[PDB]
Symmetry: C2
Subunit: 98 residues, 2 copies
């Protein structure tokens, strides 16, 4: 009841947006339940939060063909990948919060 | 000549501070040359940068016993680890950056 995730499926990746409701401590990273996704497809991760929340999640999806992290100015930046894209490639995404 | 790294060794982790000087594009992640460290020891990562820089570096040390990311309010938060600490544990380190 303190952290919501939205998941959106795409031809080429699963998007994960997280929202923080109540303020959080890091212990949360032991409790939190990470959305399960299509492994055959890479992952983009967005949300306003501490870098640690982002990194934690990012590593969590490290088996997928790639992981990218959202930056309002740029899109999703691939930070690691096994199969499809390269570190530093930028997927063209915009995320609107109403 | 756009991104500097400092390394500081400790009994229990290698600290990596990174600094950005020129503004950066994400292409940089293909070039960046990461400080090599004692694998037997975990790693703490401090620096101001985009999430992506943090995550990128963090993942880069993913073999070490753990990786933690510095947060001025809290300390170094373990975000992944193989051997020593737990995700969400907070190493109780203070980092102050002396300006000028
Ligand atoms: Mn794990
Ligand atoms: Mn890997
Ligand atoms: Mn790699
Ligand atoms: Mn691993
Ligand atoms: Mn754990």
């Amino acid at each position: 009841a303190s952290m919501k995730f939205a998941v959106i499926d795409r031809k080429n990746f699963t998007l994960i947006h997280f929202e923080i409701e109540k303020p959080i401590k890091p212990e949360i990273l032991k409790e939190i339940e990470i959305p399960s996704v299509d492994t055959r497809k890479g992952v983009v991760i967005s949300g306003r939060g501490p870098m640690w929340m982002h990194c934690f999640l990012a590593h969590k999806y490290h088996h997928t063909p790639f992981v990218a992290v959202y930056d309002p100015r740029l899109g999703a930046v691939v930070v690691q990948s096994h199969s499809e894209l390269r570190e530093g490639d930028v997927i063209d995404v915009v995320v609107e919060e109403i």
